[PDB]
Design a protein around this ligand. Sequence first.
Ligand code: HEM
Ligand code: NA
Ligand code: ZN
Length: 187
Amino acid sequence: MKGIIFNVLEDMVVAQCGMSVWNELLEKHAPKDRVYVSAKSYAESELFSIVQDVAQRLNMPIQDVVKAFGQFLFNGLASRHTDVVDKFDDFTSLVMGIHDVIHLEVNKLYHEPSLPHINGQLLPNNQIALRYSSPRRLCFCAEGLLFGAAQHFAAAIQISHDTCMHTGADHCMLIIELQNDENLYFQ
Ligand code: HEM
Ligand code: NA
Ligand SMILES: [Zn+2]
């Protein structure tokens, strides 16, 4: 898990809960004097432990917290990798380019990142079938991110998530409906 993910998480926790809470989280779930260098790899268990702690503090379902983080996370990355996201002029293009453009770039920007396997298929009625697969099973982070990407393009979406690794499958299917964006008028 790359430091950049931890950095954006810090920004989120500091904004919602305060720096005092972030320091508690860091002292408890990370070794002494931990500093997350953005480009460096760290143990994903450090992230999961922090996020699980946050969920418990807020009395929220863990996946609802991961989804919220995902939405916050898209803006964090879009602002840290503005050149990558500016390759796309709309939400649908970006989603269709997550694997072959965005995360492909991430392999050139970062040393050996740990990334999901994603494939998007355009459907009729302005829908997208996004297939997700990863041993980390962060499909709800992916949902959040998609909602973040929608917000970035002033678009509105709904997501159905009825095939899932958490209910036994070896992948998730995220069916995205684009309800509105700047190029969508009556239908
Ligand atoms: C809707 C858009 C996106 C989706 C759905 C998505 C999906 C994901 C997910 C779910 C993960 C967690 C790892 C896993 O699941 O195995 C991940 C990792 C990552 N992605 Fe994204 N992503 C999106 C956009 C972006 C953008 C815009 C960037 C930066 C330009 C980016 C760069 C990264 C990085 C740096 C990691 C961490 C890799 C590591 O820790 O080794 N992604 N991606
Ligand atoms: Na519109
Ligand atoms: Zn899932």
